[PDB]
Amino acid sequence: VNIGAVLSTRKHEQMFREAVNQANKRHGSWKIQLNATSVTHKPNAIQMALS
Amino acid sequence: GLPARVRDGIAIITTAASDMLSEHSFIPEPKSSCYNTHEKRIYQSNMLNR
């Protein structure tokens, strides 16, 4: 179950990944795994949407 | 019909462009690019909509 996310800096993405890992650990009894995917903000709105 | 709509849109655009050209003696029709829209937003027409 991939979950997207957009963060301004790498630290935000890192803590988002840590939170996703913690959530997976809290619900480890299930057979469903969550993957964290994050991207950085872009100055161009069109470029950001394309990315 | 669709052809009528397309003709009306083309006529509207042409009339607006002609009015803009005849009013200020110039037409705001510069170049364009997919990205890198920096330093080019200063030329805010604000007259094409009028």
Swiss-Prot record, chain A:
Sites where a glycan is attached? 35
What organism is the protein native to? Homo sapiens
Shown portion of the whole protein? 27 to 77 of 938
Summary of subunit composition and partner proteins: Heterotetramer; the NMDAR subunits are modular and harbor tiered domains that function in concert to regulate opening and closing of the cation-selective ion channel pore. Forms heterotetrameric channels composed of two GluN1/zeta subunits (GRIN1), and two identical GluN2/epsilon subunits (GRIN2A, GRIN2B, GRIN2C or GRIN2D) or GluN3 subunits (GRIN3A or GRIN3B) (in vitro). Can also form heterotetrameric channels that contain at least two GluN1 subunits and at least two different GluN2 subunits (or a combination of one GluN2 and one GluN3 subunits) (in vitro).
Fill in the PTM field for this protein. NMDA is probably regulated by C-terminal phosphorylation of an isoform of GRIN1 by PKC. Its phosphorylated state is influenced by the formation of the NMDAR-PPP2CB complex and the NMDAR channel activity.
- Protein name per UniProt: Glutamate receptor ionotropic, NMDA 1
Q: What is the primary gene name for this protein?
A: GRIN1
Q: What does this protein do?
A: Component of N-methyl-D-aspartate (NMDA) receptors (NMDARs) that function as heterotetrameric, ligand-gated cation channels with high calcium permeability and voltage-dependent block by Mg(2+). NMDARs participate in synaptic plasticity for learning and memory formation by contributing to the long-term potentiation (LTP). Channel activation requires binding of the neurotransmitter L-glutamate to the GluN2 subunit, glycine or D-serine binding to the GluN1 subunit, plus membrane depolarization to eliminate channel inhibition by Mg(2+).
UniProt comment concerning the protein's domains? A hydrophobic region that gives rise to the prediction of a transmembrane span does not cross the membrane, but is part of a discontinuously helical region that dips into the membrane and is probably part of the pore and of the selectivity filter.
The places in or outside the cell where this protein is found are: Cell membrane; Postsynaptic cell membrane; Postsynaptic density membrane; Synaptic cell membrane
Q: Which disease is it linked to?
A: Neurodevelopmental disorder with or without hyperkinetic movements and seizures, autosomal dominant: An autosomal dominant neurodevelopmental disorder characterized by severe intellectual disability and developmental delay, absent speech, muscular hypotonia, dyskinesia, and hyperkinetic movements. Cortical blindness, cerebral atrophy, and seizures are present in some patients. Neurodevelopmental disorder with or without hyperkinetic movements and seizures, autosomal recessive: An autosomal recessive neurodevelopmental disorder characterized by severe intellectual disability and psychomotor developmental delay, involuntary and stereotypic movements, spasticity, and inability to walk without support. Intractable seizures manifest in some patients.
UniProtKB/Swiss-Prot annotation, chain B:
Entry superkingdom: Eukaryota
Regarding how it is modified after translation, the entry says:
Phosphorylated on tyrosine residues.
Write out the tissue specificity statement of the associated record. Primarily found in the fronto-parieto-temporal cortex and hippocampus pyramidal cells, lower expression in the basal ganglia.
The record's subcellular location field reads: Cell membrane; Postsynaptic cell membrane; Cell projection, Dendrite; Late endosome
Tell what the record comments on domains.
The extracellular N-terminal domain (NTD) endows NMDARs with a unique capacity for allosteric modulation, harboring several binding sites for small molecule ligands that act as subunit-specific allosteric modulators of ion channel activity.
Free-text function comment from the UniProt entry = Component of N-methyl-D-aspartate (NMDA) receptors (NMDARs) that function as heterotetrameric, ligand-gated cation channels with high calcium permeability and voltage-dependent block by Mg(2+). Participates in synaptic plasticity for learning and memory formation by contributing to the long-term depression (LTD) of hippocampus membrane currents. Channel activation requires binding of the neurotransmitter L-glutamate to the GluN2 subunit, glycine or D-serine binding to the GluN1 subunit, plus membrane depolarization to eliminate channel inhibition by Mg(2+).
Q: How does it assemble?
A: Heterotetramer. Forms heterotetrameric channels composed of two GluN1/zeta subunits (GRIN1), and two identical GluN2/epsilon subunits (GRIN2A, GRIN2B, GRIN2C or GRIN2D) or GluN3 subunits (GRIN3A or GRIN3B) (in vitro). Can also form heterotetrameric channels that contain at least two GluN1 subunits and at least two different GluN2 subunits (or a combination of one GluN2 and one GluN3 subunits) (in vitro). In vivo, the subunit composition may depend on the expression levels of the different subunits. Found in a complex with GRIN1 and GRIN3B. Found in a complex with GRIN1, GRIN3A and PPP2CB.
State the disease link.
Intellectual developmental disorder, autosomal dominant 6, with or without seizures: A disorder characterized by significantly below average general intellectual functioning associated with impairments in adaptive behavior and manifested during the developmental period. MRD6 additional features may include seizures, hypotonia, abnormal movements, such as dystonia, and autistic features. Developmental and epileptic encephalopathy 27: A form of epileptic encephalopathy, a heterogeneous group of severe early-onset epilepsies characterized by refractory seizures, neurodevelopmental impairment, and poor prognosis. Development is normal prior to seizure onset, after which cognitive and motor delays become apparent.
Q: Which family does it belong to?
A: Belongs to the glutamate-gated ion channel (TC 1.A.10.1) family. NR2B/GRIN2B subfamily.
Q: What is this protein called?
A: Glutamate receptor ionotropic, NMDA 2B
